[PDB]
Amino acid sequence: PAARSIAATPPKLIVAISVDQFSADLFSEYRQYYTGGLKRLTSEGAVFPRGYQSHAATETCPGHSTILTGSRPSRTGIIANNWFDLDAKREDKNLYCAEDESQPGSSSDKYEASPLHLKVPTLGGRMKAANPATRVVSVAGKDRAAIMMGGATADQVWWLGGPQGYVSYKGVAPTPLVTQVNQAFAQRLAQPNPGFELPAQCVSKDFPVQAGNRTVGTGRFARDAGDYKGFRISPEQDAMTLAFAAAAIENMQLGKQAQTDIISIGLSATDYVGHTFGTEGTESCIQVDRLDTELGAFFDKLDKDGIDYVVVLTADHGGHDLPERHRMNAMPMEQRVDMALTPKALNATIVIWSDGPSGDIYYDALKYLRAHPQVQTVFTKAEIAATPSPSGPPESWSLIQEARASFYPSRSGDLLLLLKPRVMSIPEQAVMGSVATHGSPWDTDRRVPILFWRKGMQHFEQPLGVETVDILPSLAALIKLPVPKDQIDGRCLDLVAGKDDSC
Ligand SMILES: [Ca+2]
Ligand SMILES: [Zn+2]
Ligand SMILES: [Zn+2]
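^ thats the input. predicted complex w/ zinc ion below
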C-alpha cells in the first residue's frame, strides 16, 4: 500500500483487540503460518514481540485493566479475577473483579456486572472527557474483558452471556443492532459443526495426551447443534464477536464522524481453548489459524468501508501448556502443584482465606510455605509495600517488583505465594476440568505480543521489552490527546520507524 506515516494525521477509529491468553510463545510459534489478519499486523505493523503484562497476577481482569488505562494493577486496583474483602457486608467475602458487591442478595457466584472496582479512566473515558461526541464501544466474550477495556463512561458494553447471546449491564435493553446480532448468533448455535480439518501446521500436533480421566491433543471442535459449551470453547465465539464488532462499527458509523471513536474487542476463545486442552495441540493450533483468518476478514471489511482506523492487538496475559505434554516434549520437570497447597488443605495445615494455591492469602505460614519444594517464595504485605513502583526493562524485573506492580494495599493479601517455574497451579485429580492455566509470575504468563497497524505505515520490529501499560500513551499520541504522565504508569512508544517520532 501507498506509504503514509502512522502519525501523519489523527486516525478516525481506534480498534483495540485483546486476544485472551494469546501468549508471545503461542503467537511466535505460529507466526510463520499467518496469511490473514495476523500476517497484516506482523509484516506491515509496528511489532513488539516481547510485550509484558508486567505484573505478577497474570490473569484476565488485571490484564485487561492495563490495556486501555496506561495503568498497572497497582493503580487500577484490579489485582486478580477474585480477591477477598473480609470486611464486606454480605456473607460471601470473596469478590469478583467486575461486580458491585453492594447489590443485595449478591455473591461471587451470583453477581451484578459493574466497572465499579476500576479506579482509573480508560482511553475511551479520556477521549470522551475531552470530547463528548466520542463513541466508546466495548464487546467481548467475557464480561470482565469488555468492562475493563470500556470503563464506566463507555456508550456500549456487551459480552457473551450464555446461550441467549450478548448482554450488557442490568437494565440495558437490547438495541436493534444487538437483537440482530443475537439472531445471527442463535442461528449459528443452532447449526451443527462437523469440525475443522487440520491446517498443514496443525498436523504435527495431532496426538492424544492423557491428563487424569481426560484426553486432549486431537480435538477439532466438532459439536452438536445447541451445544453452547462447545460453542464457547471454540473458534466460533471469536468469529461471532468480530462479526458483532464489525456490525457495531458500521451501524454506529464509528470513524465516519468528525471526532475519533474507539472500539475495544475482547476475543476470548484462545483462553477457553488453552485452559480446556492446553496450548500445543490441534485445538489451539486450529484456533490460532481461525483467528488469523477471521481477523483478516474483519480488517478487509473495515478497509472496504473506507474507514481510517489504527489497530492495536495484544493479550491480557500469556499461557502455559499442560505438564503432561511438556513431559512428552523434552520438559520432564513439568509438574502439577501439590493438592496440599489448595485453599482448604492449606488452611487446615496452617485462619486464612485464599482463592487458589498461589497469589493472595488473607488472615482471618511463611515457615511451612517456604519449606515446600514447589514454592518459589512468599512475600509479606509489608515487603511488597516497601518496594517502589518498578521502572526499567520489564523482562528483567525481580519477582517482588512484579508483585509490587499488582499490589493495591486495600485489596491485596497479607501474603503473596509464588510457585516455582514449571509448576502448574492445577493439582492432579482423578477427574479434572481445565488442564492448563496462566496466572504465574513467570515469563510464559507475562510475555505477550503488542502489535500496532495503520494502512501504509512503515513496519519495524522492536524486540526489547515493553509493557501493555505503554499502549494508552502510544495511542493517545496519535490522536493528540494529552495524558499527564503522573496519572499513568506507562510510557509512550514511538510508532514511527526511523528519525520521526509519534511521541
Ligand atoms: Ca522514530
Ligand atoms: Zn485471560
Ligand atoms: Zn484464562
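Residues 1-328+431-502 form a domain with the Alkaline Phosphatase, subunit A fold (CATH 3.40.720.10).
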